[PDB]
Amino acid sequence: GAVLSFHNICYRVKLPVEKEILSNINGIMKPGLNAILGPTGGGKSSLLDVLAARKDPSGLSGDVLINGAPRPANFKCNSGYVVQDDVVMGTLTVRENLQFSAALRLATTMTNHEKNERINRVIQELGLDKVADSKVGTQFIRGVSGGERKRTSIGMELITDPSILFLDEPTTGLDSSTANAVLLLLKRMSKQGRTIIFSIHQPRYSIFKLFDSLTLLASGRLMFHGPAQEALGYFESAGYHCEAYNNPADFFLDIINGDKPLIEKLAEIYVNSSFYKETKAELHQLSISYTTSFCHQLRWVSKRSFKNLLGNPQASIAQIIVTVVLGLVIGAIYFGLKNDSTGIQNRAGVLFFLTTNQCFSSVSAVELFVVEKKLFIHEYISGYYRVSSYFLGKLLSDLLPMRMLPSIIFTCIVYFMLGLKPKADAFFVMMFTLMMVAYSASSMALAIAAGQSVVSVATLLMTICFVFMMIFSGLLVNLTTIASWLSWLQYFSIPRYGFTALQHNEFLGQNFCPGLNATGNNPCNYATCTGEEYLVKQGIDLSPWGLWKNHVALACMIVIFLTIAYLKLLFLKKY
Amino acid sequence: GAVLSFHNICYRVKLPVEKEILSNINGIMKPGLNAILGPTGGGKSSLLDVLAARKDPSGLSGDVLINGAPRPANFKCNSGYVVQDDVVMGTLTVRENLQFSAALRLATTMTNHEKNERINRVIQELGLDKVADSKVGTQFIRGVSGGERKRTSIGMELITDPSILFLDEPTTGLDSSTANAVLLLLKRMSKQGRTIIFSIHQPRYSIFKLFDSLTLLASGRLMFHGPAQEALGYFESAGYHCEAYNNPADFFLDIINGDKPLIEKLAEIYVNSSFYKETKAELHQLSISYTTSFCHQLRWVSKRSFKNLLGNPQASIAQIIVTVVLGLVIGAIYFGLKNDSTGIQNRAGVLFFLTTNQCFSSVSAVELFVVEKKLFIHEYISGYYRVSSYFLGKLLSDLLPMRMLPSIIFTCIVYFMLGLKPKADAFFVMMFTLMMVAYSASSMALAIAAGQSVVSVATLLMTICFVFMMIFSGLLVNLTTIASWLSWLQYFSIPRYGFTALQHNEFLGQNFCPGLNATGNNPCNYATCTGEEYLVKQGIDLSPWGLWKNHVALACMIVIFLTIAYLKLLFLKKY
Ligand SMILES: Nc1ncnc2c1ncn2[C@@H]1O[C@H](COP(=O)(O)OP(=O)(O)OP(=O)(O)O)[C@@H](O)[C@H]1O
Ligand SMILES: Nc1ncnc2c1ncn2[C@@H]1O[C@H](COP(=O)(O)OP(=O)(O)OP(=O)(O)O)[C@@H](O)[C@H]1O
Numbered sequence A, B: 001g002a003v004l005s006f007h008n009i010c011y012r013v014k015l016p017v018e019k020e021i022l023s024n025i026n027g028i029m030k031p032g033l034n035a036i037l038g039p040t041g042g043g044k045s046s047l048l049d050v051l052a053a054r055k056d057p058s059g060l061s062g063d064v065l066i067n068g069a070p071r072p073a074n075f076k077c078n079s080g081y082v083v084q085d086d087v088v089m090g091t092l093t094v095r096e097n098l099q100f101s102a103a104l105r106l107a108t109t110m111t112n113h114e115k116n117e118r119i120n121r122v123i124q125e126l127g128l129d130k131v132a133d134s135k136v137g138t139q140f141i142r143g144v145s146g147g148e149r150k151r152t153s154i155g156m157e158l159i160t161d162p163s164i165l166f167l168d169e170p171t172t173g174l175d176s177s178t179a180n181a182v183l184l185l186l187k188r189m190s191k192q193g194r195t196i197i198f199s200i201h202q203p204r205y206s207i208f209k210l211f212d213s214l215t216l217l218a219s220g221r222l223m224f225h226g227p228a229q230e231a232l233g234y235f236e237s238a239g240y241h242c243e244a245y246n247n248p249a250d251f252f253l254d255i256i257n258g259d260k261p262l263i264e265k266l267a268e269i270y271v272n273s274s275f276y277k278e279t280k281a282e283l284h285q286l287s288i289s290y291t292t293s294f295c296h297q298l299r300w301v302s303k304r305s306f307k308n309l310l311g312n313p314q315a316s317i318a319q320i321i322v323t324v325v326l327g328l329v330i331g332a333i334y335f336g337l338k339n340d341s342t343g344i345q346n347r348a349g350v351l352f353f354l355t356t357n358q359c360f361s362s363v364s365a366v367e368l369f370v371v372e373k374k375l376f377i378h379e380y381i382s383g384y385y386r387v388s389s390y391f392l393g394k395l396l397s398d399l400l401p402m403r404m405l406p407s408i409i410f411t412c413i414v415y416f417m418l419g420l421k422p423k424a425d426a427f428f429v430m431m432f433t434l435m436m437v438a439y440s441a442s443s444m445a446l447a448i449a450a451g452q453s454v455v456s457v458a459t460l461l462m463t464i465c466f467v468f469m470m471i472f473s474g475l476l477v478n479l480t481t482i483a484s485w486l487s488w489l490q491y492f493s494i495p496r497y498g499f500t501a502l503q504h505n506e507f508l509g510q511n512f513c514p515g516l517n518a519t520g521n522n523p524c525n526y527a528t529c530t531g532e533e534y535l536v537k538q539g540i541d542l543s544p545w546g547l548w549k550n551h552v553a554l555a556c557m558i559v560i561f562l563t564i565a566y567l568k569l570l571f572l573k574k575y
């Protein structure tokens, strides 16, 4: 089968400040059951990642040679990597997660019936039949414990039918007789050609027999590499005796920890050993395309995020409910506005609140998008889909429906309850304008929080930007008294465009005076008797170009921010 | 030493829907080294909690008898409980955490020098000298690994000099030769009278010798209880043989898992065993005050939260910085307001924004308070302090300084930059009013989010309430057109009181007309020529009672909400 091999592996990590993890490991793997066993945080996951082509190639001083020839281009297609920290999506069922992996990472012509057959096979083999359709962990719903979740994580890669396999701590938290079941499964599979590579913590001596090739790492340096049955012989020759300890693994790990630095002494002793010579001799003897179409990747990512949204209420149902309640409350407060000395303040207040609420709502959904960062990274480097597919899928999942909906709710209730402009064109223009401001706010939210780690800083920055934009809306300050050298910032406010468009189609045919015919017989200034005078004092144009110009400014903002978000994703250091 | 004993322990957990965890355990502990070893999620933490008096006594059908006499009142004073999930505060150093525990849970007359001596002793013994003053984990700052963190958690109770000790999975993630160090320490201590009780996952056969009394739990039922050296004899008699397996613990746990339900068969076999008779025979043979003063508990909790705030920037430094920047920006935008046709809109906008920003800021700090819920619960049931002490400590830590500060910043910048009322009394009234609204918003935040689990729902509810309150502020809707049967809600708005008080001392001596002397020669209505006419149209009283009444309404809201928060804490199911 696959014969991975490496030569002079080294690595460095930037703390301008740099360190070395993994100092100079020289070794060969083989088809069968290979292993990496060493002290925690000594270089176990690091080496596994480096072998899996999952770290930035600005540190692997050295190489990797599959069967001699360099890493084939489909290497990430032909191998599975079981992560160490359970990147399984919490709001789905187990069977749906496995369906997801099977649908994306397998062939196309395979009938769905056979995919389900394989899924049931994995479900039985991993010991998951009871929780097969249960719900994985969530903050609201307590879910299956680590055992079932980790077995889910392992199944997600086991379903891929890989010809190479990688695992990082496959049994951490698995119960003693379920870890044994897992490893007996692995050993049974590792007799058909699959080259298994994994780390492990304190295996049982029964497990220890199953191994073929063993590798000890402690503080980067390679300590031993050879068959597990001769690990004992090596240490026995180098002045140690087995019989005192009964589980070889503990004898090995105690030797490392002292049961003039020792680690270097062990390293320089190994480099003097015959195994090293055999390693060097054979080593010198020896010397992206995705599976399924774009439409399919789009379909399946969109469906998964549909399921996630329906499963998560605090961003989907909570928003709709608070929107309905606010619509009703506002319909009650300002009910039946009067064309009177109060109508101007009332109308400006209503329009400003609708606009600013449409703006500030978008933060919740972008938080739900941000928390997917690590999951997305792991799914990408594992070769699921293209970046563009993930992007458009998330768009059609959340940004399209959950933001198009509240605007319809708000207009359909408020508009006729509050007695705004009574024609139809004004109704639909209000509806469309609210849609536009919602989408633009979402786009800015994405472009700010596309590629960020922590959700609290993203939220803080987003709220700061939105506050700065709404300060320029036009209600809080009369825009014609802002100084000359600061007015230019008025063009950068989404609420400005939205609120301006809303006022322009509302105030246009209005007059707020006791009797319009003979209220001008005493034509005092500072009167605002007609609506248009109020519109002018706020600095707004009157020909339809004012309204449509606001709309096109909003559309341009949408497109620009979406492209910026896509670029921040594409160039992100996806490692 | 202490001889805990129990009889007919049972428990139930409400899923109106109920289950049984821990079915009918009957057993004795003794001074020395006792243990609980059984399959994961089979009843190991549950029993330990029940013995530790840490579950609601609506399920312990049965009893616990220390040396025969019932549980003494200082039982939570004389025992330490090492939790399973690392409730150590992430933003402190290790030595400061241990100082905290030593200062609260030990005597008073002990000189601080000796407390530090004990701390160094524990630091050496637990293997923590290197990270003794490092920083525990944080999102912003990567921190010491679980090994060091778990040793910190264990030290926090080991410093108490307890005459009884409890541990739940003391070694999960500890390195093989550090787990061995921990357990050799425990065994060495368990020869001086301390009655150690702990669970464990897959101990080594070397460790297995150290035990004195063993206890196997699998699906609630008691499987075996007797010395670890005769556990083998029991199973050997009941048709099993040891030699096939080399680590007794794995032989035991494999027997449970099948290496006609078996679990009940084992239970009914045990109840027929001689050990059961000895247990029954001896069992039938056998048959809160805090340490330090209030001032001291207050001092130390306040100091710890001081350290936490300084260590956390996103709620302490970020707020001050954004406040300064907003102060400068607002000072620039409205610079030098004019008593002119725009002054009314400008002034109302500035005052409304200041008020609503003071209101909406309080959410961050209350989030930081909410995330302390589980930590507070664990520290209370462990007998650190009184509830009132924790409450007043958190108040003097966060609510006092971090909310008193921004108001001073805002007034000192904005007030003179924007040319508001130019006397001093108005300056200080604005300052005091902003302080009051800040405190009232914080109080409502606490009373809403005192005793809540998830931070996202608390934030959502809080923002909904704040939005509903500001809708009634007076800028967005003219309060005299709200219907009769909804006006009463105007008294429930903090922004209403704050904004009203701010407008009342500002608009009072003002007139917004071209030339005041002969602008009334054309006395048209809908003019708002003087400020007071604007004040009246908004429905505000003019005698000083308007201003002071707003202040007293705010003070009453503060007191009411603080008492409500304290009651929600006190009656909380602190188990
Ligand atoms: N990205 C990183 N940043 C900072 N330090 C790192 C980074 N990667 C490794 N290190 C450091 O290198 C040392 C070894 O890390 P390593 O990844 O090999 O532990 P590990 O293999 O994952 O052990 P385990 O699998 O049990 O968790 C660690 O002490 C760690 O501090
Ligand atoms: N408060 C509870 N609510 C619901 N179920 C519970 C509760 N306490 C226990 N259980 C149930 O009882 C079973 C056993 O729980 P238990 O506490 O004994 O696991 P455990 O001892 O803590 O195992 P481990 O220590 O490794 O975590 C679990 O399956 C759990 O679902």
Ligand SMILES: CC(C)CCC[C@@H](C)[C@H]1CC[C@H]2[C@@H]3CC=C4C[C@@H](O)CC[C@]4(C)[C@H]3CC[C@]12C
Pocket (backbone or CB within 6 Å): A140, A313, A314, A317, A318, A321, A322, A325, B457, B460, B461
């Ligand atoms: C019902 C209306 C009037 C309440 C106002 C909206 C807020 C307060 C309500 C509306 C719907 C509610 C949510 C409905 C469903 C769930 C799922 C549950 O497992 C946890 C609570 C949670 C997340 C609720 C939290 C509170 C919530 C968001």
Ligand SMILES: CC(C)CCC[C@@H](C)[C@H]1CC[C@H]2[C@@H]3CC=C4C[C@@H](O)CC[C@]4(C)[C@H]3CC[C@]12C
Pocket (backbone or CB within 6 Å): A491, A492, A549, A553, A554, A556, A557, A560
């Ligand atoms: C990176 C982000 C913030 C880029 C900001 C670009 C925005 C502000 C740009 C994109 C298109 C631009 C608009 C293009 C056309 C018009 C119509 C014109 O008669 C007035 C200016 C106006 C309305 C522009 C204002 C600025 C504008 C809206």
Ligand SMILES: CC(C)CCC[C@@H](C)[C@H]1CC[C@H]2[C@@H]3CC=C4C[C@@H](O)CC[C@]4(C)[C@H]3CC[C@]12C
Pocket (backbone or CB within 6 Å): A457, A464, B140, B141, B313, B314, B317, B318, B321, B322, B325
């Ligand atoms: C638009 C303007 C005002 C944005 C203001 C952002 C400033 C005030 C905020 C944004 C993100 C914040 C940073 C977030 C994380 C860290 C890392 C930590 O180890 C030190 C504090 C530090 C560096 C914070 C300091 C305050 C900070 C820089």
Ligand SMILES: CC(C)CCC[C@@H](C)[C@H]1CC[C@H]2[C@@H]3CC=C4C[C@@H](O)CC[C@]4(C)[C@H]3CC[C@]12C
Pocket (backbone or CB within 6 Å): B491, B492, B549, B552, B553, B556, B557, B560
């Ligand atoms: C739990 C929450 C909603 C408590 C609500 C309490 C509020 C509404 C209470 C607390 C203090 C009260 C105020 C105390 C004093 C005055 C001054 C008086 O000349 C008019 C009534 C007025 C203004 C009261 C109105 C009601 C009031 C504001």
Ligand SMILES: C[C@]12CC[C@H]3c4ccc(OS(=O)(=O)O)cc4CC[C@@H]3[C@@H]1CCC2=O
Pocket (backbone or CB within 6 Å): A353, A356, A357, A360, A463, A464, A467, B353, B356, B357, B360, B361, B467, B470
């Ligand atoms: C209340 C409001 C939503 C949120 C408000 C807000 C929220 C945070 C804030 O500052 S912040 O520190 O929380 O970042 C300031 C403001 C000022 C006005 C703004 C709106 C007026 C109408 C509206 O619906």
